[PDB]
Design a binder for this molecule. Sequence first.
Ligand SMILES: CCCCCCCCCCCC(=O)SCCNC(=O)CCNC(=O)[C@H](O)C(C)(C)COP(=O)(O)OP(=O)(O)OC[C@H]1O[C@@H](n2cnc3c(N)ncnc32)[C@H](O)[C@@H]1OP(=O)(O)O
Lengths: 187, 189
Amino acid sequence: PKYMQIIDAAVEVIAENGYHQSQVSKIAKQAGVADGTIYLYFKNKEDILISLFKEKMGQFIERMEEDIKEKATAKEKLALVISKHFSLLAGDHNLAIVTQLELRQSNLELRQKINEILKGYLNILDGILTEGIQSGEIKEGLDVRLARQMIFGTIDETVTTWVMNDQKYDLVALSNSVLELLVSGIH
Amino acid sequence: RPKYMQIIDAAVEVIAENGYHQSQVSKIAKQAGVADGTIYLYFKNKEDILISLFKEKMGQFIERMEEDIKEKATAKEKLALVISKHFSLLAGDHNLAIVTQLELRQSNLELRQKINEILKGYLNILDGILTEGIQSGEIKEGLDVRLARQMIFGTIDETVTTWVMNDQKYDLVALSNSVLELLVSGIHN
Ligand SMILES: CCCCCCCCCCCC(=O)SCCNC(=O)CCNC(=O)[C@H](O)C(C)(C)COP(=O)(O)OP(=O)(O)OC[C@H]1O[C@@H](n2cnc3c(N)ncnc32)[C@H](O)[C@@H]1OP(=O)(O)O
């Protein structure tokens, strides 16, 4: 709808200056819409950011929930999550910036709302790790919470370094290397 | 410089308590017990306080760790000490941890370039640990240094973040060894 049109404009505006500096005024402009229509779909500036994450990352998470079920091993499931996460971000310069730089919010209730959306992603990781242990693919005795932190932390920092380097190298081509590092470690 | 450091300390406190954007020079000045003009005698602006805060703390963090890792032989041992020192510093200072994990995470891409340039000193240590390990035959052949470093930092960093998200209520430092072992051996059986 026009709902998606403002969401898409929001991605552009927030990426340009950062969320705090971004203005609702300029979001309407890039959307090609008037200020009042923004308040027809959204409560405020904060609601736009949450909805952005819900729509962009939330839909990614749901797709992953389905698509990993096709894959036999925990390794392969993880291979797809990383690969698809890199692809999503590499297909949109502004999306990469927003998802990385605005994931960790200072304001508590805004942070809670975004964390809640990202929990679905962490849930997937925990589920891959648990099933992996039960089948014997993954280290028995593995602290699932810690391993999920490592996996997510590694994915996130790989994307963040790329964003800091103005996305000037091929993120997607790194996914298998990232997988192997997570699977085998450095020794 | 004593007044310089007192301002840094006050800034950590105020920025952690109020958030960086809701933090203002005048409130940091009040917290430090100096006049507003005294802040500017040392800093360009609020932005410069945040950058210098990071530059300062990172400097002291390395100086402890850099002299300490030299005694340790293997890459694994050096990493062990990197993780525990990283965890120890942030567990010892509640407010500093909020700053590193949240308040320094500014989305103004430009400002974030100046912050990350300070991080480079630390990431370089990780790189050196890996390349020493490569040369001695300790590290897995086929490893990419840049990516492994991103793994190591991202993993340590996410562990601190999750801890901060949970109000720093559990013993972060005690997870050091397990995080090390995950990074060294991976998730596989
Ligand atoms: C006080 C308490 C302490 C405790 C620790 C402190 C924690 C508090 C930190 C809070 C601030 C954060 O947000 S930290 C959490 C999020 N993470 C980050 O912000 C860090 C992300 N990384 C970066 O910012 C950047 O990598 C820098 C600026 C830090 C490092 O830049 P650099 O020195 O150029 O190194 P690097 O990025 O490797 O770039 C070198 C060249 O290699 C390329 N390159 C980089 N990675 C890769 C790769 N995986 N595969 C291929 N190529 C790559 C780059 O494009 C670049 O191209 P060319 O153009 O050079 O050819």
